[PDB]
């Protein structure tokens, strides 16, 4: 939605990190303000 606090550069750097660690296309799904988390996601990226 409209309301966000986070600055763009922040987001874009995390999004970058997704590309390289890509698995289930957590890449695409996160870019959709649409995210998953469980054990099968790596510790790093799920924290992000």
């Amino acid at each position: 939605g409209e309301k966000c606090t986070v600055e763009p550069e922040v987001v874009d750097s995390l999004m970058e990190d997704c590309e390289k660690e890509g698995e289930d296309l957590l890449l695409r799904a996160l870019q959709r303000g649409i995210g998953m988390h469980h054990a099968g996601v790596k510790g790093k990226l799920r924290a992000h």
Partner: protein, 48 residues
């Protein structure tokens, strides 16, 4: 609860959204959309 479940869910939703993006490549409003932006860009370039 895990494993296949959460992935079916997420995946399917990304599908549906990507679907609705395609339908809006049927392109009327989106067409004028592109038609504009492009014009502005060209104008700016010419000015510079």
């Amino acid at each position: 609860f895990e494993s296949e479940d959460c992935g079916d869910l997420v995946k399917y939703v990304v599908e549906q959204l990507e679907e609705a993006e395609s339908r809006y490549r049927k392109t009327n409003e989106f067409a004028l959309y592109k038609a504009r932006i492009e014009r502005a860009a060209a104008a700016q370039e010419a000015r510079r």
